[PDB]
Every structure is written in structure tokens, then in C-alpha cells.
Symmetry: D2
Subunit: 320 residues, 4 copies
Amino acid sequence: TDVNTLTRFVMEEGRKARGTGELTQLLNSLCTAVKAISSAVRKAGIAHLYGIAGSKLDVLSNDLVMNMLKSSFATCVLVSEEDKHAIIVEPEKRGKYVVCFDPLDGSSNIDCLVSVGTIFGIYRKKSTDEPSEKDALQPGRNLVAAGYALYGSATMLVLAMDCGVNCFMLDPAIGEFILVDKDVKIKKKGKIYSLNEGYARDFDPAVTEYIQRKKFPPDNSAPYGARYVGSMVADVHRTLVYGGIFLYPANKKSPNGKLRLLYECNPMAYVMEKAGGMATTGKEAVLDVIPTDIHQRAPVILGSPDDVLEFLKVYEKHSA
Amino acid sequence: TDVNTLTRFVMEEGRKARGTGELTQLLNSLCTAVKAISSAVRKAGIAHLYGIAGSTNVTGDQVKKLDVLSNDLVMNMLKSSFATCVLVSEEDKHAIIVEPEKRGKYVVCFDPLDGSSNIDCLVSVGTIFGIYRKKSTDEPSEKDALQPGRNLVAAGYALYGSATMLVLAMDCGVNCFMLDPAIGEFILVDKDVKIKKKGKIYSLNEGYARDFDPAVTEYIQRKKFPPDNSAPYGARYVGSMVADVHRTLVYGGIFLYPANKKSPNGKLRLLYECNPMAYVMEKAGGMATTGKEAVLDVIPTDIHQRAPVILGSPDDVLEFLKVYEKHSA
Amino acid sequence: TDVNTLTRFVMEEGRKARGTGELTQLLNSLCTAVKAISSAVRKAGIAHLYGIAGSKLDVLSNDLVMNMLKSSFATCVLVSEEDKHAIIVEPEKRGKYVVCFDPLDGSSNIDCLVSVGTIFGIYRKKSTDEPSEKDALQPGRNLVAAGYALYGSATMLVLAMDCGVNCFMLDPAIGEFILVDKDVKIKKKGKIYSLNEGYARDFDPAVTEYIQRKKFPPDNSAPYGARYVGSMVADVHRTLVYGGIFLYPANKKSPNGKLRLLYECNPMAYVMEKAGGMATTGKEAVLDVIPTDIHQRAPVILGSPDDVLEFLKVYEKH
Amino acid sequence: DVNTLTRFVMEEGRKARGTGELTQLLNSLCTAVKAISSAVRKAGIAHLYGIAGSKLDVLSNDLVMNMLKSSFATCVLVSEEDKHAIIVEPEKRGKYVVCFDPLDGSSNIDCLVSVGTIFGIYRKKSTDEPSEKDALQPGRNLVAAGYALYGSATMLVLAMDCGVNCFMLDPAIGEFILVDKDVKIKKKGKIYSLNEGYARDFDPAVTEYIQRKKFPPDNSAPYGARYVGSMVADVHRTLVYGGIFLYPANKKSPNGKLRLLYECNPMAYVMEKAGGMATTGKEAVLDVIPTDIHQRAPVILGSPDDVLEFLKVYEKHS
Ligand SMILES: CCc1cc(Cl)c2[nH]c(C(=O)O)c(CCC(=O)O)c2c1
Ligand SMILES: CCc1cc(Cl)c2[nH]c(C(=O)O)c(CCC(=O)O)c2c1
Ligand SMILES: CCc1cc(Cl)c2[nH]c(C(=O)O)c(CCC(=O)O)c2c1
Ligand SMILES: CCc1cc(Cl)c2[nH]c(C(=O)O)c(CCC(=O)O)c2c1
Ligand SMILES: O=P(O)(O)OC[C@H]1O[C@](O)(COP(=O)(O)O)[C@@H](O)[C@@H]1O
Ligand SMILES: O=P(O)(O)OC[C@H]1O[C@](O)(COP(=O)(O)O)[C@@H](O)[C@@H]1O
Ligand SMILES: O=P(O)(O)OC[C@H]1O[C@](O)(COP(=O)(O)O)[C@@H](O)[C@@H]1O
Ligand SMILES: O=P(O)(O)OC[C@H]1O[C@](O)(COP(=O)(O)O)[C@@H](O)[C@@H]1O
């Protein structure tokens, strides 16, 4: 076939949509930052920190995405896990899109060299007022585009839009993201479950039951396999590729979940839905929750449609 | 205080031991293979497989799955070290006997790309290696690999995760080296590393719960429902041994792969998964048990023999063994 | 100044026009190709050919640029040093642009690891006829965009358009061309002359005097320095950065010059003229020569204005 | 099958019944070459030009210096960057003297032309304490010499008693790969290399030799001219393709420009070990007895029949 790169793809989609080119420039600018995060995560230059010539990853990742999006002339408001407040882009470098991002998700346990990621979500400013944090408090339903970069065994960018979910592998030799999986869809039912079972004594009765139904199948089926990496980008990527269910529900330390709706839960929910999968808080869809805080936390149960539905049936047999 | 590379370290250690060079050349040939596996695992040249020059079919055997390419890289690099007689791998049913002209003294049992079953999900993967000496007089055979893990000369792993790190355990201790992909050199980042006495993380597939033996079932409940009114232990299971055991060494805690049903003598293979990681653990002040015995004290009968494995922080493995000893009989 | 990339620059400049989007894809396809050539010229994977798993550069350069420009859906006619006849692109992948390129200029001496390059010149199909070789026989004054890629100590793409000349360094760590020099303009007069002096016997009288005026200055000033790599991309790039003059004039073996108008002479003349410099054949401007063959050779004297005008004064005296 | 520099230096040291110090020195120096290559190809350039908001000759020196000191194999280190010999601290002192040029050609690195790292290794003459006199040895006493070319691709050329061996860097895995074994030069070439901008300040012998190549007296083809202005590149071309490289003596530079210890001597050893020659006009570069660490020497090196022809013309004018 002829090589389809991210750059050719984002240009072709904008040209067929006869668009301005601001969405294309955002995604190009974001992927140049993802390439730079990947170089830094794989530790290029570590010899210079250890004295080859005689002589931050969280922050650098944020500084890379921030600077690359501000110089895009395509963003107005930027929300980062790292920045406690929204960034309002200077007037002269302003564009029509609001971007909610998590620069290096999983960096908590990056000392063990566990898979880390960049989670992103793009909205349009619908308001007529001056750029403010309020332009970022849109429900996931209004997402123009979303996705994640995985810095695992190789680096991959998953781009979810209305065309579908597209998977691009970084070729470090040329710095190009090669489309390796087009219009990807999730399995209707998987065989893997993912959650921290260390919060067992703190779990909701409904979670406790669903987990025991996978370990000890009532329908005399095969017991599910357990996988929990501790990095949402890695756990959710395996959920898209292999199928199954990722859960981060309420515990006690975190009674509204740990994971953050705007730049963790909402982007992943958009990827899942566009890939024929589901994503709930237990009560509603992640994409239907209207936010009040940029750093608001939210429960997430995402994956293979039938597996999310099975969970929801247990929640129903326990709640309102 | 001053910089060091894997190459310099292994060459200086061999001169300090006034040695032949065979171990030093083996370890350098193994590390050249590890930089090559890293380049391919990070998908360098994938553009050529997707028509950047418009040519796929079967090109330069780059259509090989990364577990075959990894094995072919480790096998050809080790054979050309002039340091190997017998080579055991996860990919080859019978041991490889190295042609007389390239034969050396060491037996290597290795796992070329551990976790490759799920490499579609871009899971952290690794090369696990264990180096033994031929203590036999008979013509090189598979029996030369059937040595217990106490007889090991050196052992360790390459993790292909966020970054690529070689962990090389010897009698000098465990040394951790980071691959700088800019210069193609492993940089000594962590020296004579020691595992924590007690951790706060447990790692096992709890989807095998209905088949878990009572000792595993109790120990797990002790970490979720602690007696001491302590914080419950956290759960991490990547599903790649290299990744889970690396986290056990850096953060502390316990990695368990027990048995019963499906794989009933454990799953993980003793010669090229369990023993390598047990030597790293024991050289870092950690522990590695099958429950009944220490992994390193198991005398192997087959090269693809499996073993049960509970490894990590000394106090954590000892707590498990107390629970096991109550249910042992 | 804020950071810019080649891909960002080309998308911003192409957004300015309503745009078909074809020229932006063409330039981004040429960008991807140049990074591929750069990797292969720096000898990435050579260990595979020498036994790592125990299991061309000029041709591979041509195949990459040909395939990348065919799959841009923006090219109709492709002329290359490598192919004797022009390439007429398949109807389904056809666009409005005619690209004339030298895929790896200097690769005759690439065994000594000499600096090499990719020279490119993009024209618009101006005919209503079926795409043909004749669509490449446009004068250099009709160039829409031109430039080169130098694979030397580092890889740089120099892109010339109406907006002027912009120089972008490839950061191989991230695989991105970083804009390092904006709206570049050449020095008025330099201190370096560039030509193969082994042809002194077959040299035109005027070149003989110009070189004798650089070695033995008439203004009792400092003699010029001589640099000649034998790769045009290297010599013209030095001419642009440090100033001076590059000459490949006529001789006996090459009475109409050696370097090729369409994919060597014209592309480099556009970059020089967009940077406030000059490029002459002696008789006329390189860009004003109407091509008759796609492999037509042309004499070239390019560089710093005062230097090319001093040569032109001696040409008028002879 | 696969021969790397690591396996080469280890095998050659075992064939020499050696300690392992020189092997360590060459592994350490080759780590520094890889790190210079990364910097020279501008990896990270994006961090300088603002991708996240918020020297090459000095870096090259610092890399080579620290890698040679941490090798525990050096006692005296002479660089072009330091006016005084560096006496390695007693706690990492070894038995070898290294004279090196960290980035030869860096004057003109802004034009992205080929650059290099030139090196020469001697053994300490002393049995007492190390001094600059342990570096003031003639090139005959060299144990190992060579150069790293950062051109189209990165190559380390290592010359020893075993001969001259060429290693290509695979940037993908960071290994130097044996690609040309016991290399030897052409008996006669067809390329001459010199800055002809010094034509008025030239010796009558140099004037004649250059005229014999431009205007052949034997009705042979006139020779070609190549002068990159980076010695590493010009001498590598001379080795791979043949011919002559001349940085001769002017009346403005009576002892030449290029430095005996870390430019002329190292390249004279490579030429001699490849069946070529290297003269100052009066004597062999390797036979000259150094009196100053930054001493300049004239250098005419390359294919044997070409340097001999020069010497015949030098004799006529002596
Ligand atoms: C999947 C649909 C899509 C994809 C990409 Cl990549 C796009 N890029 C641009 C652009 O203008 O750059 C647009 C049009 C956006 C607008 O006008 O609503 C666009 C639409
Ligand atoms: C830490 C101990 C060690 C480490 C390395 Cl890296 C070594 N390399 C070699 C070698 O001979 O190459 C030896 C000695 C071998 C022998 O004891 O038989 C050796 C010993
Ligand atoms: C010379 C200034 C320029 C630069 C770039 Cl990068 C351009 N890109 C595009 C484009 O639309 O692709 C155009 C307009 C011509 C078309 O319609 O093809 C364009 C013009
Ligand atoms: C081919 C000549 C050579 C090459 C290498 Cl690579 C060497 N390495 C070592 C060493 O000391 O390891 C020596 C010893 C000879 C000395 O003392 O100069 C040696 C000799
Ligand atoms: O450690 P826990 O409680 O199981 O939660 C891990 C979760 O926290 C996260 O790391 C997010 O937080 P960090 O970016 O600070 O690491 C998720 O990637 C991941 O799902
Ligand atoms: O899926 P399970 O049964 O939990 O087993 C996981 C184990 O299998 C392994 O992947 C080994 O198998 P592969 O090398 O074939 O993938 C271990 O690294 C890992 O601990
Ligand atoms: O060796 P000469 O006669 O000076 O010609 C050199 C010229 O030929 C070229 O090398 C072009 O030919 P190639 O593309 O075949 O190498 C120019 O790059 C250079 O200016
Ligand atoms: O420009 P000139 O006078 O011809 O000198 C060029 C010579 O100087 C050098 O550049 C050495 O000087 P630098 O190391 O300062 O660049 C040689 O590489 C080269 O042979």
C-alpha cells in the first residue's frame, strides 16, 4: 500500500471537511510534542546527566505540549493536570479550540520504567465571552477529537474523531507516525478485567460482586484474566486491542474516583464510544457528566460493550 | 562519581578478575543484541514495511515477529562471542550446541522477548538471561544446562519499557544500566542495588483465584484485609515478568506466580525466567521461593521445566512462607 | 521568536491560500522522504548487512522521492537525474504539479562520505494537454517553490518560495525539521571562490581573469579563500551561509556546463535570487533559459551579488 | 560474522598479549566519538530553539577528555583547545599519551561541512612522573592513530601495526561496524587538494607541482581538484579514492598551519600504514622531533607516486 502517516491523514480529513486548517495544525503541533516526550521518556541524553562530558519529565512533557499548542495559533484555553488553573493563551496566538490534556499519565511509577502516556481532548469555544476556564467545563459529548499517546514497548498515538479511531506507530528512525490500524473497533465481550484489588475492603458492593463473577463465574464459563499496569493509557490501550473491562470506581481515600474527568476519563470514554465500546461512572455516561471543576475527579468503568453492561446490571441490582 | 558504560564496567571487572575475556565478550555480545532488540521493539523502520519506498512482500526478513528476531539476534550474537558451548531458549525445543570452531565455556539459558504474547497492546517486554559454566567433561549436550541456579555465574534482564535498562547481577552485586538511544551506550545509573526489606505492592493474576491453594488465598487476604490495621497493599500486574520483577526490585513488595489447573507446576520456566530473576533478587538482598524450596536450589530434569515462584522483599516472602508452612503438611 | 517546524510553516503558508491542499502535501511528502534518505545516508541498519541477526543509496533515494510524491496525489510529471524519460503519474494519483529533482547529488563520491543532497524544483502544469515531458520544459522564472536537503555534518532542508528562503535543521531525536534561520539573505560580497581548478587549461578567458583577481587581488586587498567539496548542495549552502561565489563554468568535456538546468542549476538559482543573490550563465539568468531537454546541461555562476557582478564585468570585458 | 570495534580492540589486544589498557582507551574514545556524532547531527536542537520554552568544539573536547580520563589508561592528554598539556590526576593515571583534535574543521561548521575528531596514542617514554615531554615524541613511536569523520555517515578509521581498519557507525544500535579491512591506498590518484587562495604566498615548488596537474606535461588527463577545508574529509577522500593532500609552507606560514601532534602526525601514520606517504618537503612527518605541543608542520600526504612526484619538484628547487 502507499504509506499513510498522521500528517497525510490530518491534512486529508481537513481538506475533505474543507476546514480552515486549525484542527489540523493543533494535532500536528500536539504530535511534535508527543515525539519530544517519547525521546525524553526513552532517556535520550541520560549520559549527559551522568557526566559523559564532565557534568522534570512531568514538567517538560507539560512545557512541550503547552508551548506547542500556544504556537499552533489554534487554542484559546488549555487545561493540564500539572497547572492548577486553565491557561488563557495570549490574544495574538489565540484560536477556536480548548484542549484538556494529561502530559505524562503514570509518571508516579516511572522509576520502574512502566508504560506512561499523554491523554488529550479537544473542544470548540461555543461561548461568545472572553476565553475563561468555563470554556473547558463542557461535557465529553461536545468533544471534537480525543486520544492518547502510549510510550510502551513502542510509541503509538490513538486519534479518535468522527471518522473513527485511528492508531499510528512512531518510527523513531524518521519521526513519522505510521497508520498501522484503521477505523479500529472494540470486541463486544472480552476476557480481561483491570482494577486495583488493593481497595477491596473499600469497594462498592456492586464492584465486589462483578469482580467475584469474573474470578468465580456463575455461568460455569472461563474465569477472566486479571491485568493492572497502574497506567490508564496502558490499561485502556490493552482494553481496546484485546477487549475486556477497566474499572476505577469509588474507594474511601477517593470516594468520587481518583481519575479526572476532563483530561483522563472523558478522552478515554470518547475513544471507547467511537470504537463501539462503552464508558460509565455507574450512574451516567462519562460523556454526559457536566463538569464544575477543571480538576474534578470521576469514577470510570470502560471497555467491551457487553462487559460494561453486565457491571451496570449489578449496579442496578444495588442502587436507585 | 565518574561516568561508566556497560562495556567499560564488564571489561574492567574481567581485568580485575585477571580473566580470559570470554565472560566479558559474552556480556558485550549479549548487550549489542539487546540494543538491536530495543531498536526493533520501538518499531524503527516500520515505515519500510508500510510502503515508504513501495515494497513489502517478504523484504529483508523484517516480516519476522519480534520474538523470532530477538531469538535470532541473541543466538547469532552469543555464537559469535566464541564464549558459548550450549544455548537454551524459550523458542527452541532442544538446546543448541555451538559449532566446534566457535565453542566457549559458558552455557546461556535465555528468554528472548518475555511478554511478546501481548506485544500487540505494546506491553513492557524483556530479554531474560542466565549464564552458567560447563562443569562437564562430556561433549557439549543439553545435560550441561540442567544445573541448579546456585551454579549461575551471572544473570539479569533487559526491560523494554518507558526506557530500556539492562539489570546485570553478578557476585559484585546488581548493577542497573540505562540505554541512551542517542549514543547507543548503556549508562551505569544505579550501583550495587538492594531491594527494600518490606514493600507495599503485591503482584499476581487474581483471575486464577478459584484454583489458588489455601496459602496463596490467605496471604492475598492479609494484604487486602491487613491484620495489623496497616494500609492495604496495592495491586500491580502488568502480565510481563520482566516488568513486574523490575518494579519489585525498584519499589519492593512481592511477585507471585503459583499453580494448580492449566499450568500445575507453575507457569514460568525455571532455567530462563525463574532462576535468572531469583539470582538478581538474592544478589540484591531479596528472596525467591517455590514455597517448598528456594528456586536456586531446584535441580532441573528438563530445560523447559516450569517452577512456582514467589520473589521480592525479604520480609514479604518470609510472611508468605509462614502462611505456606501452616498449610504445608 | 516562538518555535516553528517545517510541517507547521508549510500548513500555515498553505492555509493563507484557500488552497487545493496539493502543494502542502507535496512539500510534506518531500519532507518525509528527506528524513528517510537522511537515516539511510547516516547508515542506520548497516549492522544487518554485516551479521547482526546472521541472516543502492542513490537508487533508494529516487524510489523514496518518486513513491512519496506519487502518493501525494499532487504530481503529474516527475523528472529525475536517475530516469532518462520523465515519469507520467497514474491518473488516480495525479495533481497539478511538475517536480524536477536530483535525489542524491554528489553520490558519485559517497564512498569517501562526502556531503550529499536532494535538490528539488516544483512547477505548476501550465498546459491543457495530456501530462507530458514538455510540462517540465518551463523556465526557472516559473518555479512555484524550490530548495535542497543537505546531508552533511547535520541534515538541513532549505525551502525557497515567494515568502523568501527559510532554513530548517533536522533534529534526529524527534524526527522534526526545526526552523533555525528565517527569511535568509546572502552577504553582498564574500571571501570564498568555489570551482574545480583542474580544468584551468580548458577554462574560458574571463574565468581565468576572475580567479587571477581572487588569488592576486587588484585592490591590494586580502586574496579570497578556495573551498570546493565537489557536491553542489554543500558548496552552494556554504556560498549562502558565508557568502562568496560558486562557479561550474564551460570547459572542453562540458562546453554547455556539466550541472543540469532543471534539477540542479534552476533550483539553486531560485534559492540564491530569493535570498538577494544572483545566478548567471554568463550570457543570461539561469531562470530565464527556456529548457529544450529535461537533462539539458547549463553553466552556473551564483552567489553574493557584488561577486557575481564582478564576474559579469570581466565577462563583458571578454 | 559481525565484527564491531569492541571485538576488534579486544581481539587485537589479546593477539598482542596486552594488559587491556589500550583496548579500554579505544572503547572510551569511541563512546566520545558517538556522543560527538549525536551533537554534530544536532540531536536536541529543538530544545535550544524553544520547543518547551526557556559550544560544539568545547563539548567535543570535554567528551574526549572525560572519557579518556575515566579509562584509567592515560597519563598526559594534549588538545588543540588547551594551551598546556593536561597531566591526568594520579588516581586515574595510566601508561598512554593521547594527542587529539576534538572537532577539526569547526571553523566552517555553520555551513554544515564534514567535521572530525583526530587522535594519536603514544606510550609514556617516562618511568618516573608524566610530563609534556611524554607527548613530544616523533610519530614513529605512535602505537595507534586515526580519525572519526562526521560526514554523510560517521566512520572511525583506526590505524595500527595490523594496518588501517574502517568502522561505520550504525546510529540505530550505536555500534561501529567493520566495513573495510587492512585498507591500502592507490599507488597513484587523479585528485589534488589545497587552498589555491594562497597562490601568491606559495613556494615555487608548490606552484610547479599544481601546474603539472592542471597542465599535464605527459599529455595525460588533467587531475581533479577537491578541497573541503576539513582535513579529516580531504585525507579520508585521499585514502578512499587516492591522490594528494597539500597544506604546504607559505612565506607567511613557514612551518605550515596544521599541527604536528594532533593533525599532521595522526594522518601521516594512517597514510603510511596504508602504503601512502607523508612529507614536510624536507623529512617524513613521522621522523620530525616535536619541540612544542602546538608546533605547526607542513604536510604533503596521499598516494605514494604523487608525493614522490612532489618531492622530485621540491628537490629541483632545493
Ligand atoms: C474527522 C473530521 C475532521 C478531521 C480533521 Cl483532521 C479536520 N481538520 C479540520 C481543519 O479545519 O483543520 C477539520 C474541519 C473542522 C471544522 O471546520 O469543523 C477536520 C474535520
Ligand atoms: C564480577 C566478576 C567478573 C566479572 C566479569 Cl565482567 C568478568 N569477566 C571475566 C572474563 O574473563 O571475561 C571474568 C573472569 C572469569 C572467571 O572468573 O573465570 C569476570 C569476573
Ligand atoms: C508559494 C506560496 C504557497 C505555499 C504553500 Cl505551502 C502552499 N500550499 C498550498 C496548498 O493549498 O496546498 C498553496 C496554494 C496552491 C494550491 O492550491 O495548490 C500554497 C502556496
Ligand atoms: C595491533 C596492536 C594492538 C592493538 C590493540 Cl587493540 C591493543 N590493545 C592492547 C592492550 O593493552 O589491551 C595492546 C597491547 C600493546 C601495547 O602495549 O601497546 C594492543 C596492541
Ligand atoms: O495507583 P492506583 O490507585 O491504582 O491508580 C493509578 C492510577 O493513577 C494514575 O497514575 C494517574 O495518576 P499519575 O499521573 O499521578 O500517576 C493512572 O494512570 C492510573 O490508572
Ligand atoms: O497471563 P498469565 O497467565 O497471567 O501469565 C503471564 C506470564 O506469561 C508471560 O508472559 C510469559 O509468556 P510470553 O513470553 O509468551 O508472553 C510472563 O512474562 C508473564 O508473567
Ligand atoms: O567533479 P566535477 O567535474 O568538479 O563535478 C562536480 C559536480 O558533479 C556533481 O557531483 C554532480 O554529479 P553527481 O550527482 O553524479 O555526483 C556536483 O554535485 C558537483 O558540483
Ligand atoms: O582555510 P585554510 O587556511 O585552507 O585551513 C583549513 C585547514 O584548517 C583546518 O580547518 C583546521 O583548523 P580548525 O580546526 O580551526 O577548523 C583543517 O581542517 C583544514 O586543513
